[PDB]
Amino acid sequence: AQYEDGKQYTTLEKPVAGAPQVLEFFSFFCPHCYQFEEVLHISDNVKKKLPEGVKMTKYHVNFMGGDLGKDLTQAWAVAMALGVEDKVTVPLFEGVQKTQTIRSASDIRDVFINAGIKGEEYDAAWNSFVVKSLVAQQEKAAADVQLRGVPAMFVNGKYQLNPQGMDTSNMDVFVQQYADTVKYLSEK
Numbered sequence: 001a002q003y004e005d006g007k008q009y010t011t012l013e014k015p016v017a018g019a020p021q022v023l024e025f026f027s028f029f030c031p032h033c034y035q036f037e038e039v040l041h042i043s044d045n046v047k048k049k050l051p052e053g054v055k056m057t058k059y060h061v062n063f064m065g066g067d068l069g070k071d072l073t074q075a076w077a078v079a080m081a082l083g084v085e086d087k088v089t090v091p092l093f094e095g096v097q098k099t100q101t102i103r104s105a106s107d108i109r110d111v112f113i114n115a116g117i118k119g120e121e122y123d124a125a126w127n128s129f130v131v132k133s134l135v136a137q138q139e140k141a142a143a144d145v146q147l148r149g150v151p152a153m154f155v156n157g158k159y160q161l162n163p164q165g166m167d168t169s170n171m172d173v174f175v176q177q178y179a180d181t182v183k184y185l186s187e188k
């Protein structure tokens with residue numbers, strides 16, 4: 001076939017009941033995640049090729065960056081709760097990987113403050129049980145598929161994208177091959 005298990009995607013031995021339709025995992029410590037966000041815009045390009053209104057979900061993971069990696073999963077929980085993902089993703093990625101000015105939870109907080117989130121509303125979210133729960137939910141989603149690598153995308157809790165099965169001679173072809181594969185997988 002044109003699409004084959006083992007090539008553009010792999011199939012989960014343990015299908016995940018009730019997982020989100022399009023599920024991405026990333027780490028602000030992940031170098032290809034940096035690319036996926038800044039260079040490739042994987043998410044937007046998948047969204048343009050999916051039917052309107054369908055849910056894409058994106059979660060942070062703990063297993064890179066030790067203490068700070070976990071701080072970052074909590075910060076991502078804060079961004080989701082406040083709905084400011086678009087405001088802090090680039091500055092968080094660059095703070096960790098480009099300028100390397102993010103070395104503590106306080107530095108992470110600075111990024112939100114600079115992006116115009118009020119100090120009071122940051123700290124309140126950071127400390128909230130709503131956020132504790134959003135941290136739990138990110139961990140659980142990752143756990144359900146024994147995630148050991150990012151960036152990762154899962155479709156309908158069954159299928160996992162295999163980016164290394166795709167052309168990397170050309171960034172634009174990669175992206176469209178990636179997006180087209182997600183579309184195909186969602187139509188199963």
Ligand SMILES: O=C(O)c1sc(Cc2ccccc2)nc1-c1ccccc1
Pocket residue numbers: 032035150151163164167168169170171172174
């Ligand atoms: O498999 C690889 O080497 C590449 S290439 C890439 C971005 C890109 C595309 C086209 C041209 C230049 C760069 N992401 C990956 C990747 C690797 C492991 C897991 C997930 C993704």
